[PDB]
């Protein structure tokens, strides 16, 4: 019965290994995307801030 145990151990260990590699790949991709979206969001924040500042000054000129 122990030989069946060792066979199933090998199979499950091999499966868990492959799973983990897939998760590592997906996590890396998600991190890359998070970096790019954070950059874009900060740029948009700065752009809108200066936009509102300039628009308020233009209104004040009136």
């Amino acid at each position: 019965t122990r030989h069946s145990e060792i066979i199933k151990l090998e199979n499950s260990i091999r499966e868990l290994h492959d799973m983990f590699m897939d998760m590592a790949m997906l996590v890396e991709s998600q991190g890359e995307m998070i970096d790019r979206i954070e950059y874009n969001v900060e740029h948009a924040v700065d752009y809108v801030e200066r936009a509102v500042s300039d628009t308020k000054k233009a209104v004040k000129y009136q």
């Binding site: 199933k8 499950s12 998760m23 998600q30 874009n40 740029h43 948009a44 752009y47």
Partner: protein, 66 residues
């Protein structure tokens, strides 16, 4: 030998099954955040374009008025 072997097989089986199930569950959940994240990128870029074009057109119109 018998008692220790039975202990080992039982614990190995239960631990392996737990790890397998948890791994499959994490596998299945990751895709939901992936797709949502595609969606949020879409919305973010649309917002960026819209606001940029709006402000540039409005500055041009204000210059025309003034």
């Amino acid at each position: 030998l018998a008692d220790e072997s039975l202990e080992s097989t039982r614990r190995m089986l239960q631990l392996v099954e737990e790890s397998k199930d948890a791994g499959i569950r994490t596998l299945v959940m990751l895709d939901e955040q992936g797709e949502q994240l595609e969606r949020i990128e879409e919305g973010m870029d649309q917002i960026n374009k819209d606001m940029k074009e709006a402000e540039k057109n409005l500055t041009d119109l204000g210059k025309f008025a003034g």
